[PDB]
Design a protein around this ligand. Structure first.
Ligand SMILES: *[C@@H]1O[C@H](CO)[C@@H](O[C@@H]2O[C@H](CO)[C@@H](O[C@@H]3O[C@H](CO)[C@@H](O)[C@H](O)[C@@H]3O)[C@H](O)[C@H]2NC(C)=O)[C@H](O)[C@H]1NC(C)=O
Ligand SMILES: *[C@@H]1O[C@H](CO)[C@@H](O)[C@H](O)[C@H]1NC(C)=O
Lengths: 50, 124, 106
């Protein structure tokens, strides 16, 4: 069986009066597909994974 | 950062061509690259694109299912497989480089091309 | 997604403060960039993210916009500025170019 451990990263600058670019990003998207903290860690159980 | 193309010519509609574009002066596998053509008297229309690792390929609707995009990271070369060329494909083609470097293990966005080649026209 | 550039053609003289706009027909937020196209030559990048001046371009260019409208301004026209301009979005992988525009001498 094959399990896909996909990690998504996305971020953007805070939209506002300042069009700064070299600044650190303010909003952060980090997801781990079917990961859901209330349920617990996502552990791979199939023989093959990527 | 020099880009040079080849494979221009005239073929009867319905044939096939092997377009090419070589790159040098930067880490070839770190940047996504795309093919774009300009029809005589018209603007720029996007043909196809590929990620630095070559894992993902993209095509426009009018270009969909008709051609295949490929790249070879070992030789710093780009290839466009022309197949079943219709009359509307008569234009000049350009290979461009995306400005954002991405890790080889990552599939990411593109769009802000910064460097272009010389160009290679074709006729059908 | 499709974009319209207006006007398609205009003529101006040296020192004129030329202003040009293109519409995105969709919320693009900030994913727009402008290009330089001297006919008979391949294009070159002018401004990315609709507001950043590329390191290889003189400071006489500026741009701004958000949402669906976007603008490009030239502080003062110089004799080499006579060339085709182009806006293109990257808010979707199926990126598209604008309708095109040409500046002319006067
Ligand atoms: C943070 O980024 C994540 C990236 O995963 C965003 O999740 C994505 O949100 C969009 C909009 O809800 C989802 O698009 C649609 O999802 C349905 C799901 O069945 C699908 O049928 C549609 O075709 C379309 O794809 C997207 O799939 C979803 N991705 C995942 C992996 O969950 C999230 O919205 C972002 N949040 C913020 C506040 O920026
Ligand atoms: C997933 O996490 C949410 C919180 O984001 C929680 O409310 C929900 O119950 C969890 N899903 C399941 C199916 O238990």
């Amino acid at each position: 069986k094959h399990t896909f451990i996909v990690l998504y990263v996305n971020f953007e600058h805070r939209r506002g009066p300042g069009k700064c670019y070299n600044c650190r990003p303010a909003v952060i998207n980090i997801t781990l597909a079917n990961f859901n903290e209330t349920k617990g860690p996502l552990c791979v159980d199939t023989s093959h994974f990527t | 950062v020099q880009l040079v193309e080849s494979g221009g010519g005239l073929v009867q509609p319905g044939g096939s061509l092997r377009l090419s574009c070589a790159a040098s002066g930067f880490t070839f596998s770190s940047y996504a690259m795309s093919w774009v053509r300009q029809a005589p008297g018209k603007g720029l229309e996007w043909v196809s694109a590929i990620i630095g690792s070559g894992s993902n390929t993209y095509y426009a609707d009018s270009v969909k299912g008709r051609f295949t995009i490929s790249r070879d990271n070992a030789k710093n070369t780009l290839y466009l497989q022309m197949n079943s060329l219709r009359a509307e494909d008569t234009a000049v083609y350009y290979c461009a480089k995306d400005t954002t470097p991405r890790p080889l293990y990552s599939s990411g966005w593109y769009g802000s091309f910064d460097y272009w080649g010389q160009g290679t026209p074709v006729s059908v | 997604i499709q974009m319209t550039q207006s006007p398609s053609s205009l003529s101006a003289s040296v020192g004129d403060r030329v202003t040009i706009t293109c519409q995105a027909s969709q919320d693009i937020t900030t994913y727009l960039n402008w290009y330089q196209q001297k006919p008979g030559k391949a294009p070159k990048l002018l401004i990315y993210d609709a507001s950043n001046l590329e390191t290889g371009v003189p400071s006489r260019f500026s741009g701004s916009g958000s949402g669906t409208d976007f603008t490009l301004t030239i502080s003062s026209l110089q004799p080499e500025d006579i060339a085709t301009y182009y806006c293109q979005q990257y808010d979707n992988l199926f990126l598209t170019f604008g309708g095109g525009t040409k500046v002319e001498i006067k």
